[PDB]
Amino acid sequence: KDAWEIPRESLRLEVKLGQGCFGEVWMGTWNGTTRVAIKTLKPGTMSPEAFLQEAQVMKKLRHEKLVQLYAVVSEEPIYIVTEYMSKGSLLDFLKGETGKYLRLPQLVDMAAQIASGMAYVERMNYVHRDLRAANILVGENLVCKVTDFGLARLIEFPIKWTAPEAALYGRFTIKSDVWSFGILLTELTTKGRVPYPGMVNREVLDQVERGYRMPCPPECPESLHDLMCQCWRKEPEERPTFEYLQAFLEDYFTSTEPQYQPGENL
Ligand SMILES: COc1cc(Nc2c(C#N)cnc3cc(OCCCN4CCN(C)CC4)c(OC)cc23)c(Cl)cc1Cl
After folding, report:
1. How many other CB atoms sit within 10 Å of the CB of residue 188?
2. Domain for residue 205, yes or no?
């Protein structure tokens, strides 16, 4: 036990949110004062370690653009508590009612916060391993955060989002992370479409390894799709840092596309 543990009776579960073969996720209150999100366990389903060693990683990380780990409880019902992100994943947010109103500036800006959260991950010497719209959460005012560190390791699998070297040879790096980021940019520019439309896993891996790359999304600026291609370089070390990515996105409409004019969708 560490100073991350709270009583169960501190809490209270209310409205369900998702289910799983891991447990489930609720809106809660904390000590009567704090809307939280609680992630329960189905007591025998996962290890004690397994369900939580994702959140040892969440103790050693702390950034505005990552989701805030609040507390843990470690006898079943076993829980982990976090800040409540009001709009759920970015995937849903992008497919939902509001998605179609989003244009480049809100999208580039969301990519920015994310890049920023990862750029911190980057300098904390870590890799996330499952980066994609659906592991990003949204709050109000278009605030995006990275979460789902359930595979996040210190540097001593969904292939569409995964880097080649990482899928074939288990070579995960912050640079493999950059690869996903680049796919995530295409989610953001398509308003949530699945990568490699009409292609199946083995088709992706085969074509990706042949050097195919997703082409420019409709209405997306070539400068934006170039950045993506930089992220998908066959050579991970030649792939840009997230700190490069963070600043390039933040300064996007001034330094790169000062002449951006809104279109039908973007
Ligand atoms: C607590 O522990 C963990 C929780 C999570 N997942 C979440 C975190 C976190 N973190 C924070 N906030 C969340 C809010 C959610 O729902 C919001 C309501 C959805 N709607 C959108 C549409 N409109 C119209 C109604 C509202 C949600 O379920 C979709 C999951 C959340 C992860 Cl991934 C890992 C750990 Cl360890």
Report:
1. 25
2. yes
Length of the chain: 266
Question: Catalytic site residue 148?
Answer: no
State whether the beta carbon of 188 lies less than 6 angstroms from ligand 1. no
230 three-class SS: helix
Where a domain ends, among 84, 103, 128?
A: 84
Q: 87 near 132, Cβ under 8 Å?
A: no
**What does the DSSP 8-state code read for residue 66?**
B
What is the side-by-side strand order in the sheet with 79-83? Answer: 13-19, 23-30, 34-41, 79-83, 69-73
Catalytic residue among 2, 130, 148, 177: 130
Q: Which is it for strands 153-154 and 126-127: parallel, antiparallel or unpaired?
A: antiparallel
H-helix segments, 6-156: 48-56, 90-95, 104-123
Range of the domain at 21: 1-84
